[PDB]
């Protein structure tokens, strides 16, 4: 629905929607910007990620509320409404995955952009895996794993251990291991090794980069504290 708006106006409006906490608008504006067919800048990739993370985050929180009510109960209303929210969430994940496939990932040549999009791909398959129960559930889990793994391989070859996207990717892959793949030891090992190798690289950073990296290291430590 955004084809008649200028790319720069879509970007401007996405920033306004973020300030207004109108994340569904924000996501639609950024979807329109992606569909212009040009690659996304660092800041623009951030806007895309923030928009859809907020949208799906609200759907995931609602799905978890309804799922717990449904479990406590087990007429059809709780199941029906959980299924409605679940279908809406799957639609948003499919939309994001479609933007990544057409054609963000194939046009992403630099390590920073390619790792960013593969992390997104892993995240949205992870969100699909959280609600999955059928024939394709193992394939959904393996799609998340495969996206995260490729992003990790690139990030380890091409980025310093303190790079925020490398740190965030390792954080989320470790959550995938703990929550989705039932591999808590892998989750813990990944979080520890990521934290320790980042610690040893902080000395190379400016004060502003140091602030960015240690913020994400604290999330790794929070999980390690929760898990051990």
């Amino acid at each position: 629905a955004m084809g008649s708006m200028e790319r720069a106006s879509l970007i401007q409006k996405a920033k306004l929607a973020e300030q207004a906490e109108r994340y569904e608008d924000m996501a639609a504006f950024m979807k329109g910007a992606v569909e212009k067919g040009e690659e996304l800048s660092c800041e623009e990739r951030n806007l895309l990620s923030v928009a859809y993370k907020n949208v799906v985050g609200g759907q995931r929180a609602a799905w978890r509320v309804l799922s717990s009510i449904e479990q406590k109960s087990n007429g059809p209303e709780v199941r029906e409404y959980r299924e409605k929210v679940e279908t809406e969430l799957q639609g948003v994940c499919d939309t994001v995955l479609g933007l990544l496939d057409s054609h963000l990932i194939k046009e992403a040549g630099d390590a920073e952009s390619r790792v960013f999009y593969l992390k997104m791909k892993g995240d949205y398959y992870r969100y699909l895996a959280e609600v999955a129960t059928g024939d394709d559930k193992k394939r959904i889990i393996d799609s998340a794993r495969s996206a995260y793994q490729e992003a990790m391989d690139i990030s380890k070859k091409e980025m310093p251990p303190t790079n925020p996207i490398r740190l965030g990717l390792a954080l989320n892959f470790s959550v995938f291991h703990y929550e989705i793949a039932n591999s808590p030891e892998e989750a813990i090992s990944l979080a520890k090794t990521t934290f320790d190798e980042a610690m040893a690289d902080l000395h190379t950073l400016s004060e502003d980069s140091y602030k960015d990296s240690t913020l994400i290291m604290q999330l790794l430590r929070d999980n390690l504290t929760l898990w051990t």
């Binding site: 923030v50 993370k53 995240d123 965030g168 954080l171 989320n172 959550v175 703990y178 929550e179 994400i216 999330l219 929070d222 999980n223 929760l226 898990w227």
Partner: peptide, 7 residues
Amino acid sequence: RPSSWRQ
């Protein structure tokens, strides 16, 4: 329960 990346 665990933290994934967030701003």
